[model samples]
Target: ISPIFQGGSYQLNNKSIDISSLLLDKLSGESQTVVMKFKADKPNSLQALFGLSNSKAGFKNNYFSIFMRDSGEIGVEIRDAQKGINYLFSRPASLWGKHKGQAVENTLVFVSDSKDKTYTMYVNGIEVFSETVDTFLPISNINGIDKATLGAVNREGKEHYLAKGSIDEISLFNKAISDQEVSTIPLSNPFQLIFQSGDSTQANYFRIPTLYTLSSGRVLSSIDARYGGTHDSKSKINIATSYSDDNGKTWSEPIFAMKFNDYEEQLVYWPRDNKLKNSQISGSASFIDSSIVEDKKSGKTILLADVMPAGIGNNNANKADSGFKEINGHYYLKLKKNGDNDFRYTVRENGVVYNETTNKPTNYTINDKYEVLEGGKSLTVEQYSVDFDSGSLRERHNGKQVPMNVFYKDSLFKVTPTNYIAMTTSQNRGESWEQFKLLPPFLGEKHNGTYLCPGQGLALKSSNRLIFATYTSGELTYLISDDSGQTWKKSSASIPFKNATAEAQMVELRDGVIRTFFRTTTGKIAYMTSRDSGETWSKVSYIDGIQQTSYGTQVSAIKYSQLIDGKEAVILSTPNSRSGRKGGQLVVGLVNKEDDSIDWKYHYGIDLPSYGYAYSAITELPNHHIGVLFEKYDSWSRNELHLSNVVQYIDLEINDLT
Candidate 1:
């Protein structure tokens, strides 16, 4: 019979294989041979490709192992106290242009002859290293030895020295094999690349993936098309979208769901502060942090994004004032004349710009470059530019600024390039989208003096109410739309938390309560619940068993129909590492109807150990499968920008996870 492999030529990503069942006492003898064919995935780290140990505490007592070191050297170790001696041999694979760092096939052979008291090692049929010890220690003399393993070694009940590569085949013989027999061993290629960077039509780098399954059995995916580097905020970015109609088996061409057109003549304009330098500038606008939700009542899919003026970001935008003023109990954009300190206002009423001072529709317009223009002449405006010497704002011409505005700044009369929220809609199940619209100030106006940063919203199943999470001055607030998103009302409820740069999502319990999960700076996930359809919320509390990076990252949560223990369940996608942006895992939790709490039970790893993983989205696809879209690289920390194929997709079955 042919050699038996438990899983048959499989790939490993910081994982291992168990060969305990195949190990037997009959194979142990004084003269023996072992052979293996494999290749390394990444050659920068030390790894154990194959190992044999008497106990679970690997390499401590009686053991034999092969290791690939970071310096492209292959080494073998044998420990046997009964023989009064140990043995070790190593050779540089690079001598034959067969370095362990390169992803190339290699055949390894080991022979032990008790009569000759010698051990020999071969790489691709060539004897690279050999040793003749004074003591003779047979393979059977290994104390309490029973099984061997491939791709990993166990140390103190934990996995260690995991091989990041593939093992095509392994074999053992009771008699020492000859040089001719070792030359007959064959290598196999069984691994395939799933995602290739720089090979697709998407942007040079893709980040912040958000996946949603429409009610019509279609899968919708949105990602940050980072044109500049993967750096957040201060990069040229747009919200691009793709759809999979066949349950994620294939995807449509990526199209811009919300894009900034620098060359367009009709650009949106806001005040620019001179005190801050514009780091991110595109056309008239730059879009980032995409969020999506489907309106069940109207059959409309809504996309929300953070709209930055040519040069501003979340960290620099003005948070003191929302650039809005309440007149007659309605909010209007607070504006000022060019070079003037006094304020005038424009209110968008029924899609028409109306000057509040005259109470009449105004023809004030902005050019394609976002320059404020009356007729054909550019209106010169005074904005606070950075006075680097004093670290203060001074009045300067906004025209010299490469990017447009700031979202937050300190000047009351001075206008900084402020960031706003922009949105688009799809009426045909994500096949097409409408033109992007900048949300009016009324959607986010609050009695408190804090500005708003939007997050993903959900349409409640019980009441069909659209509730979204918004952050302001280290507090969490809600934006509720009762009329299918034509207008919105700010919730009176506000939860104070420190450094609330939160990206949140909500799920409605079977009992009609809503729980909001958000990222916090404390290295733990925090959540709150609303009993009155998002009008009021409980105190913020950290999740018991979940840990994350202290810097905080976005999370995606969805209500799954599958029941667990007779209760409805919710699925969450986020990185599980406490270190940094790594350990991408999917967690399934059951919601308690009594307290609106979650009990996370199942977790599945998606990326290699400590490999770059951040910003993931999960959705329930057709036929009881889960679809996920995620960033496969640490774009935030990497220096080189816009590497290709950073966005990836995977499908999982419910049984595979449970």
Candidate 2:
């Protein structure tokens, strides 16, 4: 049995009850039950009466009762008529066995007689107690009998008592009902209902899709899954992927690509013995930034994913952090070839090492053999290098080369403390992903624990070649995957700022040159270009009127179109501090062909009301409309822990800029 009040109280609904608006207006003859279905934190109390003011007329001719069981002991009290002169009652039945709080489906009824002169209480189909009192008198204006409360007690000018247990049902009758009748009422269960709307798109105000247009003229869009849990890597959630066959006028219902009920841990490598020696392998896991591409050599559509792994001889469980042994192991780059819309992957491993004997350099090999080396210290061997002209060893013992790993092609590729960017591919047209490959380690022992993520890497239209940018330890590294991700080559050029790490976005220009736009750690949007197919790059500079920081920003190209008034443009999205902290901005800047600088005259920005609006992706549709997606959160809660939002806008003309 629980407690109840017959005065005035408010019920804070947690989306469960369907209490009609009319019923909430005032008290009625019918009784309503307050059910507590789940466990809630303490201090969850309700008051039955309020709006009470201290007065001279004492409370009189009112009744109250409690049908409660307290397991080891039970007691009830009616306080009034001078606080010290109150009434109390204890369990009349067994004091211990029948008084516990574990009783299921039980009822507690407190009713006042029609004349409001007496009170009666019942518990679990039995008349537990009864009393004739004139204490809590329902005075017309003094104590307010005009208002009846439920769930909570009167707290306007008095103390508040919160209920700590579940309340199945509450009923109020004109007169005191019998104990038998009180036990027959049914229990109540409630559910929650919530709604979200997308009526506003001018400021990117709704949850929308980040849209993309394919070479075949088909439109693609995707909704990101909420992060966290073991299955996060697999994107195992109710994410939607939609497509438009005719054009942007219509879209198909987002088909569910992956769904998980329990979402268990998808750990790739969980070594039991603490070491990756004999029989154990070391494979690196990385997430690549995805893009659309055309295979120049094969003439087929292909998707590339990259991942780096330390071969069997390396220690996998070493937990890559600072103060660990220098890693000199083999790293790999994997390729997933697309077949008529389906994707299949193939891996090719490569790395760099010194040819000590020849006093030169060459690629090392573990090849494809998976032999588990037994743990021990013996059999140190040296390599014999031959001079290109003399064909002889440069030195006898240039220190044993002892398999120092042959993964990265050049020393120019940069890596982060614990992340890598191998390759990016998508079978669901960039909606959902299957797997990713890691590039071989670029900055070895120096930044061994550093993790690297790709900014943007894809084949551009003009040059018909693929180029991308990556960052490690506050430095930017550029690379080219000419042979469809089967192999990689370090570009001769890079963007090296004093103490700033960068996240870049690259696109091919109409002149066959590649333009790389990046966000610097010093809070600025910068740009650079590559003239010779990503081999060498230009100096980095700022894009005026754009805000930048470590939180990251994105830039994408929108080809000249009749809808956009036929002018080439670049769209940038980032949190804007230039306009004060009122909100964030998404800017559209015109690209200057001659000097590769952005024209601020074409700039326009939208404000975002939240924080942590970084890690963005952008695309332009055929109708001259643009769509953007970015992390929606309060702070950098980890790459695996963040939220995202979709923003779409349409009907813009480049000539309207100035």
Candidate 3:
């Protein structure tokens, strides 16, 4: 047979053939399959792959094809587009050893009649697997069969799972062949290999192949040589880019990108504590004042990490007693140099000595070690002893030693917070990044004070506006920037509470309205609108499903969408203990088409055992598909944290529920 023909092509007259007509023309359906004497090629296995049915009324449905796994011990079944329904079928190979590993060229045949609605398989001129079913599938009223694809189908207008294999010959027969006649069909040439494994000795091992079209129309085929085998669970397999110029008829050799090595380092310990001597106490000093900016001059990226690391600690622990200081007399602070994992003193206001945890004053000491000065006297003596158990100090004291988890705020937080931020850039779409200069605080020398830690900061659009939502001590300060990274503006605004700390996110809607979502201490998602951008905000409004418990009910992220229908929708993924699993739920809300009440709806509930998900990020993809990625781990303990960067892509077709 020839590769191309006026209307179609054919192979060896003795070659077994398969054909799938998108039009399902009644004339061609009368007779579809032609058969030749069964003959196996090179001890290889083969089977017919076809869509059992066609779409009706233009409604798309998923289907699958069948084959034989190597070794001939079991049948290989691959699903096509079907997501909701489950199908059941079996092969005679499971019982009779008739076709076991034996080349079909020996004695067997198979034939399919499109009009007759039956598939007939035979062995030695005798029927083996045969079945007659009614309609194949529902009718999808789409355009001509020309738009139809092979290997996969159009389910609800989606193209998924292009088959990966080779097709040699296909014949069309109007009449159904009898069981005896079907046995005369020729077997597939097992010698025609599609794609093979790295090692010929290894069975069922193959690389992930990509099918795409090039500018030219030459058919080419290739394997992704980078990742030559199947990917194991949790293994970071590299993905290569492959192209096909012949409309997926063939593909070119894969183009390998750099291998991915996204390592997540845990903060087991700083190791600085064990290095301290009895004469020198060691404790972590931290801060969380960081901002992102775009360089106006060269349009580069810049990040500023600001920190103020000194405060008072009295033998008599109390919140009021632990106020700010003018000098480093009794304070200590450290700055992590840019691009370095370790922290150094880039801005150390000297002479301020932090006292150890003891009745007597002494240099920083931990684990009951006395870092005392000469004459056996404590190096630093506390003026008074305030009850750390009571007052504002209680606000900072977490039940655990690490009261505040800083890493969640920024990926670069060391053992503790630092007054420095490392600038990094990515030009290759986050594939790789380079570190830049370290951005330190502008605090002058001889300055001292308690700079309280805020939750996290948010980056706005326009490439130049970055609002660092922070609470320094008891004041609300806005570390604002206008000219990208060249200069910044710091302004202090009076907020409600003195011990108030929380991060907020802003979204610019299609109407140019900037909406801000913030977490409140009362356990709820609060909102505010800034008609004039981040300069000012409206009165805060509260959203439901937020809890009052202090642990982590306040952490949440929001995104705007036009899902479920043409109306605008907002999706908020949050942890909900309402079901007792303390798991998570995907919350959906709509911009009230009537009174603007913002009535919300809770769609899917996820309750994975031993796994809790939170801190989600949502983005809209090219189509009507929504892409969701989130942090999946326990917030209470780091030991329970394991990275699960889940990408949930959903197709939407909304209708009015009312």
Candidate 4:
């Protein structure tokens, strides 16, 4: 039986399939399986994927259903008229996960085994959740399951929980299907979303996936948890970490590797308005664009992120202020008190605030949260939370509100609205991280220091230097750590070109030579080489083979370590698109050792034009598999779609590209 023909096409939203005819009685059996493939238009909460019920008033009338929430949280429900039970899966779906919001498809499986009293749900090919329930009731026994809907549930004749997308296929099995059988089912894509938007507790949007395989062989994935959509900064964003122990199959729950204490940390839901979508989420401090590297000498993992003051991004940062003031030879962090035009205070030794004119300690102290306090009491007004619907700030009213940090607008004190680089170390490969240490302005004084370390950098094998490429509006700075990160120096490069140059990923060629593949506005990926451990670089040039647009996206490259066609290979992940960001691809560049340039070859298409593609990162897994984490949508162009599962992943072998 087909959908009731109430009308559903790719251009419209309201739709569902009349699934009342296909194996309706099978759900009443002791063991059963339901396999359905569908696509969701929005990750809004409480949308039904499929439903079966005896009554129309929802769980009120004995029902069994599979549903999802804004965070892509998947849930299953079975009701006994009055005693209703539900199970929620641990992993969320990236609702509009297919081809640029074009209903491609996602396969989901729900299996019930009465003998074991367990129900399991699989997303894609991975078993996300499987657990036992004691109060299990046969869906038919609840009231002899009658009506069923594919995209939504019909309640009281006024439809409710209507899924905003389309469905592809549905299959039913009266007998329980083996886990192995579910694993063998073909899926449109193996990639599942990990970092999601619309999470009230976390940020609403995320970008920039930093994937790395640690020295200990654990796969590490970090991200830009963008709270204010994906605008560079002037937004509330934090650097977070998630790792996979069993290669790229599964990942651990994410935790903040670095965050800001200023302003209330709340989800800024993607505002549908054109004004809010383009504007920044001001008054919140941020740590954006992180890079993870492990020190080879000490085996210690280091995390580097770009730290921005509240309301600041490179676009409007204070050019004269580097967030520091020179006191004698050493620099001290400058601060401004409320209602002051000049920075009158400096954070001196022991985290105490010192009057710049008086040169003596004041009663105000800075806590770990960066709150300025006097006599153990905060010095500013309570912070406000963002109203999810309008993207406007909401007051706490009578409830106790979170105290604002000094860096927040009009707080008791303030820091410069600029950017800095921060470093933190983890001994156990990102299980935990040290408090971030703010690096001195590596660009020297008053450089605007809009510096950002976007993706995973390299831990040099040839020297004591830890090098990663940092970018600003018009230049790229290679920050070199000479002492395994105790201190730092930099070698800056400027491409004497018209377009903005920023965001590069570097890989080491043989003989300690370094090659960087970076983004440029000139319609193709650009490159540079440094021979003296990042202290010097060759002229800038574009890899003539790979094509890009003026509105460039971050490109990722990693040395394959093994021989490809008897030549060293560097693999890159970027959208090979001439139009909108589509055509996600993996390209192999055989190194031309003679000139320190890449010989672009083996252009492997990872996705078709039907799918949107953008910002991606690549790493070599311990098992010699190449793991690439990519944005599965044209996130740069779409602002209203708060996405999860957008940071999709693919695990491939070298042979796949060759």
Candidate 5:
């Protein structure tokens, strides 16, 4: 391949290549062709892949470029001076597959013809899209090309849409390329790095990936953007989100959908030692393990995550009370006053603090800032900041008093120290999220230690049912809702081996019939089913093809919209090894109606045993493709507290799996 600019610097590693010597302005042709290979490396914001223009390293009024857009489209933009001429949009993510920490490397050949005023886009050497335009500006007149840069097209020298990732093998030609010539080029990767720990989020690690396709055809992915290590609860962690409009081809910049302001958002490695880790997060309120579901009826998406109070984890949680009291059929968030003999007040209706003994509202009210205001004034408190030396949560106020809510650890009065479920709703297909509200103790007032399945929930197609997989005290079950999450009740369904199961996921097989797949102590994937909306379940069935840790790993399973092999299908993402969180795979099971069992037909390896693969989630995208998001990290090693570990993405055809 001939080079436009050599030495890798031309790939947009913050450097520009002078291409004035090529004298492309003197070429007497109306056709221009460029064949380039690149991998998108960063969060996209109209990143310019490569451009030929008058500007040395920025955008120009009269130029042509291959640019990636925030909407996940690789668009070709050509402009004459300042007026826009043509934009050829193609979502390669919509055409083929994508990969994890490894991005989807694309070998794209672009051609512009002024004679026909046409633009053609070829992906992976295949002619994907061709179009004729009114005034398609060819690069033949794009002369005096002072510079050619990657991922950077600016206006008046403003550095915007700069290139990211490595650019390679950019060959330019003046003649129209034949279909057979383009066919000889390489293909795109089957996987991509959709989300990662980097400067965009400042998060060192990401975990707990959940994929949900909204009613609007956009795919919403939620993940635990763990700023610290993947310590489950300790350290600062927030539920981050990114969505793709072009199936799973490209994703937007991560938004901190659910976060706590108790600590600054920065990378702080969670200590490996048990006691040391706990000490660092003494004042950290963290939201971990996300579960996303959309109510098909209302078209509203709900997100659920385990909200651990400061200095609390599942093992050390106070499971006696769910930090609330069921008073007169209504639950109130309980609070303990510092001078009281016992818990004496509750945050009741409209956030007014009610004295338990007096049964009357006090002067205290929890304000919008989550601070307790007494007589319209908040109590003095000390805020926290990180200690650079130890990555510990330390008082940042220098003993200076500030107003804070009793729910905050620095206050004199505090909510019960335990774990709770944080819930948030998005009415606009996850474009924006509402403030997180805790569910009114789905496990009831006595059990405060329930952990939500870290992937996704399901709304039964055949019924007005919304179900989320949950477990508390080693008993695997679900929280059922009939009114689209207006209210929730713990399922009465009973499954065998209550002591074996932990996290789980659900897939509705036949309208009212639902299959619950989960992790168990036996190191294999176990599942059960309910025909009556989780009120009753059948005997447990084991899918021994996929293995997990004895401690149990979380899983994601969803029903395929289409039937495979004339039978219903369920796709599962799990770690397919017993010892550690490795050998992860995506398994396709053909459902058999006679015994309500899976045939376990096709399985694709997500990662080899040598690499890390932990939690995962999957959902069906447009064009009969399945989108998977997973944690590409070692879950069994204390020393596996690696930074910049990305939660990867992969999409494949349902037909290919069969």
Candidate 6:
């Protein structure tokens, strides 16, 4: 009988076609043949072209699949149910390009003869290779061969190796066909475009998503809406947010939880440069690195972010002093004018920046974009360009072509600290937000010079006090808020270790002690414990058995509903590797009630091996499913600039994770 075309043509565009309907009891024959004709819309990332298998055991255990490797080689892989090795065959593509610049059309053919226990492959109409297997296991013996897919493989409820091109035709036969029959099958184009990029109006690039469930059972999602490019700092960024009202079945339009204007301004003040008026000028006031939390006491949701001054970042902010001074037992930011030895002091007490020298509330305020404004006008700012060869300052105004002088400074230049922590509140379950309240560097005593970046925040169930972790001068410091996030106090206790810098999240243990997990420079996750309700923390310690890149990356950990080994468990989502940001995995750690330590042993890979996985956020949904929002590409290390730094989302079950 002539083969049947199960599905019409499919314009994959990095999407998969479901052929599960054709796989019903179809592989029980003594022989089978599969043929497909497609063209690479782009080069395939190490992924499957088409395959048939049981959904439970996956491609690694019991199945048959044809895959395209990263090296431009196409191969066949299969496994049996007897817990032994299966068949493996591979060959480099002889007639097609494997990248976007050189995509080409190609036809693939596979014939399996269970009677003779042999397999053969053909490219186009020519037979390229054939193999005789030793095992006589019938095709029906393959466990869970109940579903078939083209353009991708679905394993454990998630899709993998999605083909990045068009699939014109797929023909399946109940018996192995002859070489003449393979040549007679006609290729046709019938697929339609189903998915593509830029489907949302938020931003061109999105990264670093954080999801949380509010006390009122609403789901809130936040991400970095990067505008300029995917670069971490030195770019225009905002914390964009979206929420779901129907258990993630649908989502509301995105709104800015925290945003900054794209105006060019001087944000950093250097002591040596008299031409620059303010320490907080010279760069765009960008808000990046977002963390979300809920004030259970008031049923209010809070968003925290690191407010970076123009042209200042985490690396430079740590080096440049914020001009903080300790007078008796109080803390203040000391500022000096041009050629003045005398200093003026400003204090940010009770969520407001104040000029203490004038003994009056400063008219200075920050706009919605975190821009510093004086008397409703943005302060005129200029930046000094240093000529390393001549050791002189150069200035340009209006545009790069307009030559200007750095000495032409404006009196409206306001000098303030380079960075600060800003908070915005939502009383109606994140539907709207209030104006931003800035938290200066002054936390009293010697804790003044510490520079901080934002991380995930949490409200301890035991104490009902709001606490969040911050990347502070090479250590993780906790910020405690007693008044429903209106006011925050920095912890006087020091972080237990050094050489660690990345955002972290906190979850309260069953014993009421708060445990914090952060990304470490040691290529592993590090944790600390706070017994005094996040006021003080123990020394830093590494969580063994987990491996990551040496430069370190962000991670997300949350309390899971499922119990493991008869104890409460926490699920961690992060990239698992020692190289670049790739190999995303979901790990489950059983909490030890005695010491409050976690044993991270059970885990599963959430993405393919070659996928460029970076920062991720995971939250448990009310339906007992886990939702993950993650950076689908490693925008930090890769050189592909114009490509979208997509923030993708997926839902998984407890069994799917295992």
Clash tally, candidates in order: 25, 50, 47, 1, 11, 16
In the order shown, the candidates' Cα RMSDs to the true structure are 14.8, 20.2, 21.8, 9.8, 14.3, 16.1
* Candidate 2: 10-residue stretch with minimal lDDT: 189-198
Model 5 weakest 10-residue run by lDDT: 92-101
lDDT of 5 by residue, 1-658 (tens): 3433333324565443445455344345677678777665443555777766666434356666787643234567666544444454553221221243344566778877677777888755434456777666666465344545556754455555665566655677766666676767666655566666454567766878889888788999998877656666755678988899998888898787787766557765444444554444556767888889889888889998988766666767787888999978888888898777678888887889889988988888887545778888767666566654645445354444556755466676688888888788888888788877778786678877577888888888877788887787646658888887888888744555554536788888886788888777787778888888688887777876776778778878888888788998888888777677766678889988897778889887654443457788888997678887776666555544442433667777765565
Encode model 1's per-residue lDDT on 241-331: one tens digit a residue: 8888988887877777876433121111111222332222332335777777889999899888877654566666665555666767776
The per-residue C-alpha lDDT of model 6 at residue 387 equals 23
Best model number under lDDT: 4
lDDT per model vs. reference: 0.62, 0.37, 0.33, 0.71, 0.70, 0.62
Q: How far does residue 500 in candidate 3 sit from its true spot (Å)?
A: 4.7
Measured by TM-score, the strongest candidate is: 4
Order of the predicted models by TM-score, top scorer first? 4, 5, 1, 6, 2, 3
TM-score of each: 0.63, 0.46, 0.37, 0.73, 0.69, 0.62
TM-score of 2: 0.46
Off by over 4 Å in 1: 1-202, 263-284, 334-363, 366-416, 442-456, 635-642
What lDDT tens digits, residue by residue, belong to model 4 across residues 127-148?
Answer: 5467777766654555645677
Q: Write the per-residue lDDT of candidate 3 for residues 1-658, one digit (tens) a residue.
A: 2111112222222222223452244323333343323222221233432233333334343343333322121121223234333332333221111112332332333455555666555433333345455633122211233222333343444433333333333233455556555534554322112232222212122222212111133222222121111211121222222223323323334332212112111111111111221111112121222223233334443333322122201111222322122244332333232266544322122322232232233232211111222233333222211122331211122222211211112112222332233233333322233433333232333222223222223345444465554443344445565654445455444445445444444455434255556544555666666655456656667777644334443333334445455556766555665321134455666666464456676444433322344444333333323333333333333222211111111112222111
Distance (Å) between predicted and true CA of 254, model 6? Answer: 1.1
Candidate 6: tens digits of C-alpha lDDT, residues 1-658: 7664455567776777777776655555678887777666345657687877666754446667877754335677776656475877764422243222233456778888787777877754434456677775444456666657776766765677777766677777788887678767653311111111233433555667788887666788877766444555555566777788766666777777776443422221112223321123234546678788888788888888766654555555534454455656555544444464454535354323455567666676444433345666555444333221334323334322211111123323233435556788898887888766656554443342343333358777765588777765456656788888766677744554464565577777764587777877778888888777876778888888778887788888888866867889998888888877766788988888787778886877764545557788788888888877776555455333323424556667777765
Stretches of candidate 5 exceeding 4 Å from the true structure: 1-190, 269-279, 368-370, 376-382, 390-403, 496-501
